Design a protein around this ligand. Structure first.
Ligand SMILES: Cc1cc2nc3c(=O)[nH]c(=O)nc-3n(C[C@H](O)[C@H](O)[C@H](O)COP(=O)(O)OP(=O)(O)OC[C@H]3O[C@@H](n4cnc5c(N)ncnc54)[C@H](O)[C@@H]3O)c2cc1C
Ligand SMILES: Cc1cc2nc3c(=O)[nH]c(=O)nc-3n(C[C@H](O)[C@H](O)[C@H](O)COP(=O)(O)OP(=O)(O)OC[C@H]3O[C@@H](n4cnc5c(N)ncnc54)[C@H](O)[C@@H]3O)c2cc1C
Ligand code: SF4
Ligand code: SF4
Ligand code: F3S
Ligand code: F3S
Ligand code: FES
Lengths: 631, 257, 111, 131, 127
C-alpha cells in the first residue's frame, strides 16, 4: 500500500513540523555513509553539492562529458519565486493556489506548498552563488511576467536562465569535488539497480569510453535522471535523454506514477526531413502577435507572402471565435496536428503550419517588434534560413515535458526503501500540467532544501555499511547486463535502431499524443509488442562492447522506450477523463476544454510491475483537497 | 548538392589515425552539418563499416558538447556559431570539406572525432567558484549590483566550455576560458573576497594541465561561439598583477583521480 | 448603505487574506487602463509613481508650479514605524493599540 | 533652530524676552468616507491621504499623517485599484459624452458669474469673516 | 532607480555620520532658482551640483552616479543655461547656504565619468 506520509495540522506549518519530527545524523557519523547520486542536472548537481557539504561520501554519475553538459542548461525561461518584489499581490499562498489550480487538481497539496515555501530560499541561494540575474538601474533584481501569469514573479538571466543556474550548481559541485568529499564519474551510465534485503544498496554501471562494467555499493541511491520525453521520436529535449534508469527502477520494484501525463509545447521548428530528430523550443509569446494559417489549396506552390488574404484558410480564426484567438496550447496544437495529418501541411515533409507576422509588422512598429523578439528571429533565420520579417514562420508543436515518473511520498522516497527520486524523474507535484518556470525551481528545491532532511531522516534509522560488491545480487545484475549487451550485439539484423525509434515515435505521436481515444490507444497497444519483437529480431548494432559504441547505448535506450510505451498507453487508456495534458476525445466540453471527473478519478495511479509488460497492477492514492476546492 | 568529405578517423587513443574520404550525392541545403554526419553514419552502417563517432547533446549551441574543426576553422567557416548550428546552405556544391577534432596535448583523442575535455573541469575545480554553503545565503536584494557590471558579468559568463578557443589558439592555450570565468566571478561583489587568490590558482592549474601561453594573437575571440571579447584576458592579467603585488601564492594543483 | 468591506478572522492576517482574495490585472492588460491622480502630495506622488511603475497610464495634476511644492514638504516631525530598533518594547501591535487609543475609539481597527 | 526662526520672524530674541504663542488649527481628521479598499461611495473614486476620514479617529498621533499618506500611496492603493479595475472593461468612455459638456458648462457659468458680480468687498474680507 | 516593494531592510547598508551630514547639507535645496538668476552667466550649476552631491554621497546612489551627472549636465546644456565661471554669487545668494564644494564634487564626478567613456543619453524633450 502507498503511504504519503504527509504531515497534519495547518498547511503553513506542516513542513516545519515534519522537519522537527524527522531524525538527525550527527556530523561525526555523516562520514560513515555512502550515497550514490545518478544525474548531474539541476536537481542532481544541487543534491550532490549539498550532501558533500554536509559530509556524506557522495558518488555522482553522468553519461555526458562533463556535469555541465547535462540538460536543464537550455531552459530559456526564468524561475518562479514568491518574493513579491514587484508589489503586485504575489505571495506564497498565491503561488501554491496557482500551482495547484494549474495542475487541474491532480497532485498533493503539501508538496506544492512546500515547494512554494522554499522557492524564496532557492532564489536567495542562487543569487548568493554568483548567478547574474537581470538587474534594474538601481542595482536591485528585476522581474518579468511569464506570458499569462497574473503576477511578475519570474527571475531571469537574459535568455539563458537555466544555463546560469546549472553553472552555479556545477560550480558548487566542483568545489565539493576539489574538497574530496564528492567523487565524479563522467561518461558512464547506470544500467541496473542492485537491491539487497529490500533496500536499494547499489548500482551496476558501464562507462562508454572503455565499455567496462562496474558495480558500486552505497547506503542510499538517488535518481535525478530527468524526464522521459524522448519516448516520442521527435521532442524538444536532448538526444541523450532517456528513461533507462527509471524503467530499471520500476522493474526492480518501484511504482510508476501517472506515466500518461505529458506536456507539449506549441511553438517548435518543424523538421526538414526524416533525418532530423529534435525540435527547437522558441517561446510562448510568439502566438500573442501572430495568426496561424494554412493555404486553402494543398498544392499551392506559390510563395506564402504572395498568397492573397482571401485565399488563406485561417483556421483557429474561423474556428474557436472566442478567447480572442488566444486559444490554449492544447486546442491549437491539436488543430495544427489535425490540419497537418489531413495533408494541408506547409513544410518540406508536409508537417507544419504558417504563422505570418506581416499583419503584426504593419500594425505595430518594426523597431518595437524587433526589440520584442530579435534573438528568436535571428536564431530562426540561422536554423531555417528564411527571414521571419518577410516570410511566414513555419511552426509545429512537439512534446516538451513529462509530468509522470516514479511515485514518491512526502519524503521523496519511492516504493523501494532507500531509493529517492528527485527532479523530473518523479511524479513530484506538477499534477496533470506543469506551470511555466516551475520545473527548475522544483528541481532546485529537491536538490537543496528537501532531499538532505529526508535522506538524513532515513539514514539515521539504519547502520552504515554492511554491504559489499561481492554479494550475489551484484553478480546476478552484472550477469544480466552482460547477457543483454551480448544479445543486442549478436542480433545483427537489418534495420537500424533509428528506424525502430522513429516507428515507435510516430505511432505514439499519432495514437498516444494530445488527442487520444479508446480505439487508437487499443490499436497502439496491439501494435507495440509487434514492434518490440521486430526490434529484438532485426536490429543492427555494429561494433564491440569494449569500445566507444554509441549504437549500443541507443539500442538500449530504444529497448527501454519500447518497454515503457506499452505501460504509457495502458495508463492513457485506463484514465477515462481529460485533465491537463492528458486529453480524451470522448470527455470534453463542447467548447473544447477538458472535462474532469472528480468523483471517480480524483487519485494518483501508481503502476506496479508484475513481471508481465501487458498486465501491470494498479494502485490508487486518494487525493483530498482542504484549502483549494476543485472548480 | 554533392559533397566530398575528408574525416579524421582514429580507432582509439593509442592507435594512429588517418584521413578517410567519402562522397555524398544528395545533400539537402537545409540540413545541418551534424544531420549530414548522421546520414553518412547510417549509410556506413548499412554498407557494413564502422560509423563515425562525434559529440552532440543539445543541437542548439548552448551545451557546448559538440566540437568539430571544419575546413581548418573550428565550428565551421561561419563565426559566432557552434558546430550543431552550422547548416550547409552556406557551403558550395562540389566543395571538399575536411573535419578534424581538437588537437592539443591537454585534449586526448578517444575516437574519430571525440576528445577528452576534463582539463576544463579541473581548471574550474581550482578555485573557479564562490565558497558559499547551502542555507547561509542572505536576502537576494541585500547587495546591489550596477546594471553595467551585471551585463558585463553575463557577457563573460556565457561560456559553453566547448574548448574551441584552445584548438584555435596556435599556442594551444586555455587563456580565454580562464579569463572569461575570472571576469564573470570578479565583476560581482559576491566574488570579491577571494578573487585575487582565485585567478592565480586557476592560472596555475592551466599551467599544470599542459596548456600553452598566450601571445595575444586573437584567434580565441574570432573563433569563440559566444563572442567573448579579448578584454576579459586583460582583466585577468590585471588581477594577476595585483595578486602578484600582494604576495599571493598558488595552492597545490588539482591532481586527477 | 455603507459597506466597510473589512476582512474577517484574526486581525494579524486580515490584510494578507484580503490581498489573496482580491483580483489582479495582467501586466499586459495594465497599459490599456488610464488613471487620473489629482494631487502631488506625499500620497499623491507616491501613488502616481507606484502606478507608473506598475504600467498604468497615469495622469497627475497639481495647481502649484512644480510637483515638489505640495505642503507635505513643510512637515518638520519625523515618521513613525514599528521597527523596535531601540529595543524599548515597540511592536506592530503596540503601535496599533496606541493609534486606536489616541483616536479615542472612533476609527476602524482593520485600517 | 526654533529660537533662530522665532527671532527671524517676530524680531525679538526669546533668550531675554518672553515669546508670544497662540494655538491654531493644524489638521483635519475628517474627509470623504472610504471603505477598506480606500474607495468612496461613488464607484471608481478613490480617496487617499488627508482628504479621507481614513483611520485617525477623533485625534491623530504625531508622525502619523506622513506614515498614513505613504502607506496609502505605496502599499495599499495599487492592490485595491487593481482589484477594482480587474472587474471592469478598459476604455469605452470619451470626452464627448454629454456629462462632460454639462460639467464644463456649469464650470464656465460659475466662473462667469463670479467674474461678473464685481461687488465691493474683497475675497479676503469674506474669507476672514468666515474664518 | 528603485521600485516599490523591492527595498531591503533599512539598516542593511551603513552610512557614516559625516557622509550623511554632507548629503543632507547638499540635499536641502528648495529649488527656488535664485542661483540661476544670481550668477552673471545665468547657469544652473549650483542646483545640479547640489543634487549630484546629495545622490553621490550615499551608497544607494553609487551604482549609477557616473552616468547620472553627465545626463544632468547635458540636460542643463540643453535647457539653455550658461556655463560656470566659478564666480561664486550663487553660493552667496543661495538661501540654504550650499557651498561650492558641491560644484567641485560635480566636476570630479564629470571628469571621472569622462575617463570611463560615459556617453550622455537623449535629452528630455518637454511635452
Ligand atoms: C528545451 C527545454 C526547455 C526547458 N525550459 C524550461 C524553462 O524555461 N523553465 C523550466 O522551469 N523548465 C524548463 N525545462 C524543464 C527542465 O529543464 C527540466 O524539467 C529539469 O530542470 C531537468 O533537470 P533534472 O536534473 O531534473 O533532469 P536532467 O537535467 O535532464 O537530468 C539529466 C542528468 O541525468 C543523467 N542521466 C540520465 N540518465 C542517465 C543514465 N541512464 N545513467 C546515468 N546518468 C544518467 C545525465 O547524465 C544528466 O546529468 C525545459 C526543458 C527542455 C528540454
Ligand atoms: C505645517 C505642517 C506640519 C506638519 N507636520 C507633520 C508632522 O510632523 N508629522 C506628520 O505626520 N504630519 C505632519 N503634517 C501633516 C502632513 O503634512 C499632511 O497630512 C500631508 O500633507 C497629507 O498628505 P497629502 O498627500 O495630502 O499632502 P498635501 O500637501 O496635503 O497634498 C496636496 C496636494 O494636492 C494638490 N491639490 C490640492 N488641491 C488641488 C486641486 N484642486 N487641483 C489639483 N491639485 C490639487 C496640491 O497641489 C498638492 O500637490 C504637517 C502639516 C503641516 C501643514
Ligand atoms: S571561451 Fe568561447 S571558445 Fe573558449 S570554451 Fe568558452 S565558449 Fe568555447
Ligand atoms: S539658490 Fe540654492 S536653494 Fe535656490 S535653487 Fe539654487 S541651490 Fe537650490
Ligand atoms: S589567440 Fe591564442 S595566444 Fe592567447 S590571446 Fe588568444 S589563446
Ligand atoms: S555664481 Fe554662477 S557662474 Fe557658477 S560659481 Fe556660482 S553658479
Ligand atoms: S550540440 Fe550542444 S553546443 Fe553543439
Amino acid at each position: 500500500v502507498l503511504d504519503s506520509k504527509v504531515p497534519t495540522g495547518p498547511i503553513e506549518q506542516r513542513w516545519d513540523k515534519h522537519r522537527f519530527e524527522m531524525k538527525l545524523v550527527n556530523p561525526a557519523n555523516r562520514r560513515k555513509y555512502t550515497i550514490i547520486v545518478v544525474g548531474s542536472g539541476l536537481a542532481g548537481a544541487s543534491a550532490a553539492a549539498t550532501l558533500g557539504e554536509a559530509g556524506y561520501n557522495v558518488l555522482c554519475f553522468c553519461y555526458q562529458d562533463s556535469p555541465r553538459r547535462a540538460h536543464s542548461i537550455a531552459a530559456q525561461g526564468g524561475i518562479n519565486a514568491a518574493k513579491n518584489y514587484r508589489n503586485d499581490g504575489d505571495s506564497i499562498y498565491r503561488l501554491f493556489y496557482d500551482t495547484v489550480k494549474g495542475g487541474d487538481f491532480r497532485a498533493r497539496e503539501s508538496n506544492v506548498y512546500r515547494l512554494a515555501q522554499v522557492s524564496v530560499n532557492i532564489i536567495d541561494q542562487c543569487v548568493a552563488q554568483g548567478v547574474p540575474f537581470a538587474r534594474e538601474y538601481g542595482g536591485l533584481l528585476d522581474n518579468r511576467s511569464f506570458g499569462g501569469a497574473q503576477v511578475a514573479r519570474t527571475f531571469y538571466a537574459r535568455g539563458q536562465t537555466g544555463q546560469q543556474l546549472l553553472l552555479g550548481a556545477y560550480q558548487a559541485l566542483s568545489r565539493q569535488i576539489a574538497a574530496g568529499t564528492v567523487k565524479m564519474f563522467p561518461r558512464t551510465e547506470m544500467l541496473d539497480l542492485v537491491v539487497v534485503d529490500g533496500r536499494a544498496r547499489g548500482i551496476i554501471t558501464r562507462d562508454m569510453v572503455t565499455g567496462k562494467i562496474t558495480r558500486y555499493a552505497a547506503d542510499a541511491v538517488v535518481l535525478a535522471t530527468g524526464g522521459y520525453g524522448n519516448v516520442f521520436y521527435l521532442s524538444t529535449n536532448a538526444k541523450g535523454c532517456n528513461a533507462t534508469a527509471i524503467w530499471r527502477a520500476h522493474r526492480r520494484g518501484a511504482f510508476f506514477g501517472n506515466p500518461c501525463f505529458t506536456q507539449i509545447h506549441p511553438t517548435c521548428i518543424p523538421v526538414s526531413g526524416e533525418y532530423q530528430s529534435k525540435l527547437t523550443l522558441m517561446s510562448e509569446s510568439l502566438r500573442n502577435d501572430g495568426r496561424i494559417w494554412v493555404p486553402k489549396k494543398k498544392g499551392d506552390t506559390r510563395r506564402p507572402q504572395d498568397i492573397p488574404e482571401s485565399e488563406r484558410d485561417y483556421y483557429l480564426e474561423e474556428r474557436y471565435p472566442s478567447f480572442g484567438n488566444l486559444v490554449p496550447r492544447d486546442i491549437a496544437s491539436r488543430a495544427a496536428k489535425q490540419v497537418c495529418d489531413e495533408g494541408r501541411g506547409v513544410g518540406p515533409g508536409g508537417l507544419g503550419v504558417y504563422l505570418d507576422f506581416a499583419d503584426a509588422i504593419k500594425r505595430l512598429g518594426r523597431q518595437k517588434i524587433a526589440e520584442r523578439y530579435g534573438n528568436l528571429f535571428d536564431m530562426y533565420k540561422q536554423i531555417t534560413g528564411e527571414d521571419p520579417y518577410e516570410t511566414p514562420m513555419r511552426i509545429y508543436p512537439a512534446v516538451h515535458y513529462t509530468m509522470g515518473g516514479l511515485w514518491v511520498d512526502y519524503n521523496l522516497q519511492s516504493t523501494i526503501p532507500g531509493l529517492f527520486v528527485i527532479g523530473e524523474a518523479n511524479f513530484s507535484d506538477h499534477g496533470a500540467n506543469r506551470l511555466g518556470a516551475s520545473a527548475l525551481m522544483q528541481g532546485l528545491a529537491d536538490g537543496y532544501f528537501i532531499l538532505p532532511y529526508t535522506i538524513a531522516n532515513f539514514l539515521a534509522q539504519v547502520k552504515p555499511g554492511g554491504v559489499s560488491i561481492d554479494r550475489p545480487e551484484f553478480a546476478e545484475a552484472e550477469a544480466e547486463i552482460n547477457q543483454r549487451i551480448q544479445r543486442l550485439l549478436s542480433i545483427r539484423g537489418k534495420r537500424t535502431v533509428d528506424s525502430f525509434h522513429r516507428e515507435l515515435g510516430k505511432l505514439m505521436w499519432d495514437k498516444c499524443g494530445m488527442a487520444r481515444n479508446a480505439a487508437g490507444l487499443r490499436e497502439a497497444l496491439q501494435r507495440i509488442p509487434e514492434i518490440r519483437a521486430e526490434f529484438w529480431e532485426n536490429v543492427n548494432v555494429p561494433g564491440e562492447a569494449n569500445d566507444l559504441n554509441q549504437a549500443l547505448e541507443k539500442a538500449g535506450r530504444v529497448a527501454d522506450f519500447l518497454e515503457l510505451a506499452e505501460l504509457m498507453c495502458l495508463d492513457a487508456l485506463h484514465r477515462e477523463e481529460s485533465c491537463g495534458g492528458h486529453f480524451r476525445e470522448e470527455y470534453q466540453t463542447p467548447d473544447g476544454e477538458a472535462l474532469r471527473n472528480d468523483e471517480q478519478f480524483s487519485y494518483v495511479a501508481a503502476w506496479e510491475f508484475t513481471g508481465d509488460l501487458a498486465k501491470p497492477r494498479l494502485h490508487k492514492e486518494p487525493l483530498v483537497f482542504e484549502y483549494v476546492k476543485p472548480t | 548538392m554533392k559533397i566530398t568529405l575528408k574525416i579524421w578517423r582514429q580507432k582509439n587513443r593509442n592507435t594512429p589515425g588517418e584521413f578517410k574520404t567519402y562522397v555524398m550525392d544528395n545533400v539537402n541545403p537545409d540540413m545541418s552539418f551534424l544531420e549530414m554526419l548522421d546520414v553518412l553514419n547510417e549509410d556506413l552502417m548499412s554498407r557494413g563499416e564502422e560509423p563515425v563517432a562525434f559529440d552532440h547533446d543539445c543541437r542548439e549551441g548552448i551545451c557546448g558538447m559538440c566540437s568539430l574543426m571544419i575546413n581548418g576553422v573550428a565550428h565551421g567557416p561561419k563565426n559566432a556559431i557552434t558546430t550543431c548550428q552550422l547548416h550547409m546552405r552556406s557551403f558550395k556544391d562540389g566543395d571538399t570539406i575536411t573535419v578534424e577534432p581538437w588537437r592539443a596535448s591537454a585534449f586526448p583523442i578517444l575516437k574519430d572525432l571525440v576528445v577528452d575535455r576534463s582539463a576544463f573541469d579541473r581548471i574550474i575545480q581550482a578555485g573557479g567558484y564562490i565558497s558559499v554553503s547551502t542555507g547561509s545565503a542572505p536576502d537576494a536584494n541585500t547587495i546591489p549590483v550596477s546594471k553595467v557590471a551585471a551585463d558585463r558579468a553575463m557577457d563573460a559568463a556565457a561560456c559553453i566550455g566547448c574548448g574551441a578557443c584552445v584548438a584555435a589558439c596556435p599556442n594551444g592555450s586555455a587563456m580565454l576560458f580562464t579569463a572569461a570565468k575570472v571576469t564573470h566571478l570578479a565583476l560581482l561583489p559576491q566574488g570579491q573576497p577571494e578573487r585575487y587568490q582565485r585567478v592565480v590558482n586557476m592560472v596555475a592549474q592551466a599551467d599544470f594541465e599542459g596548456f600553452g601561453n598566450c601571445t595575444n594573437i586573437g584567434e580565441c575571440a574570432a573563433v569563440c561561439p559566444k563572442e567573448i571579447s579579448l578584454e576579459t584576458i586583460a582583466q585577468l592579467n590585471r588581477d594577476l598583477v595585483m595578486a602578484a603585488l600582494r604576495g599571493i601564492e598558488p595552492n597545490t594543483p588539482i591532481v586527477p583521480a
